[PDB]
Amino acid sequence: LAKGESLPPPPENPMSADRVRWEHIQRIYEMCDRNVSETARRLNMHRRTLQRILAKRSPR
């Protein structure tokens, strides 16, 4: 029933909401040389947030 927000849209767009975030995590993670604190702060998130994002894509 209905459309728009009544029927969940897939990640159809290249610039997904979280996709943009992960991209920002990388550009900072590179420049701060793996400083998770700078990354999370530059991503506007908690250190755990940045960590979990890294930790789900690595055995770390």
UniProtKB/Swiss-Prot annotation:
Descriptive protein name: Photosynthetic apparatus regulatory protein RegA
Domain of life: Bacteria
Organism: Cereibacter sphaeroides (strain ATCC 17023 / DSM 158 / JCM 6121 / CCUG 31486 / LMG 2827 / NBRC 12203 / NCIMB 8253 / ATH 2.4.1.)
Residues of the full protein shown: 125 to 184 of 184
Function field: Member of the two-component regulatory system RegB/RegA. Involved in transactivating anaerobic expression of the photosynthetic apparatus. It is a transcriptional regulator that is responsible for activating expression of the puf, puh, and puc operons in response to a decrease in oxygen tension.
Modifications after synthesis and translation: Phosphorylated by RegB.
